[PDB]
Ligand binder design. Structure first.
Ligand SMILES: [Zn+2]
Ligand SMILES: [Zn+2]
Ligand SMILES: [Zn+2]
Ligand SMILES: [Zn+2]
Length: 114
DNA sequence: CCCTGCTGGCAAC
DNA sequence: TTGCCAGCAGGGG
């Protein structure tokens, strides 16, 4: 069980820190500020990612192991991987011929050959 | 406290 | 269309 129950929604947590942090989703409080562009964020880790992706140079990026797409955030590569390079049991037919593929990247690359 | 990964709106192709 | 992005919560220290 988790005793700390949010007074506004159905969220509940085991400790007060996370309930306080969740309450920022209701109050709209943004405690953290980028010292460069003065944008504000709900969490400190979000601000750190903002400064890395917007105000830092020479930042290494993540190449997809199955195509040449380069993606800035590792989690966004996950979304790419789950969308483009994941098995589709029901398959997808080319919109120009009867060829069927089981990953979206294969479908899109084949369709381009027409 | 911080690190990590997921989420859906939204520019930008 | 999909990567960019801040919002967001779980988990470990
Ligand atoms: Zn709530
Ligand atoms: Zn900034
Ligand atoms: Zn790929
Ligand atoms: Zn075809």
């Amino acid at each position: 069980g988790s005793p700390f129950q949010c007074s506004l929604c159905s969220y509940a947590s085991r400790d007060t820190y996370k309930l306080k942090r969740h309450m920022r989703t209701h109050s709209g409080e943004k405690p953290y500020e980028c010292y460069i562009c003065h944008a504000r964020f709900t969490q400190s880790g979000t601000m750190k990612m903002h400064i890395l992706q917007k105000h830092t140079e020479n930042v290494a990026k993540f190449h997809c192991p199955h195509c040449d797409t380069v993606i800035a955030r590792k989690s966004d590569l996950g979304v790419h991987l789950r969308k483009q390079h994941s098995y589709i049991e029901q398959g997808k037919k080319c919109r120009y011929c009867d060829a069927v593929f089981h990953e979206r990247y294969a479908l899109i690359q084949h369709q381009k050959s027409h």
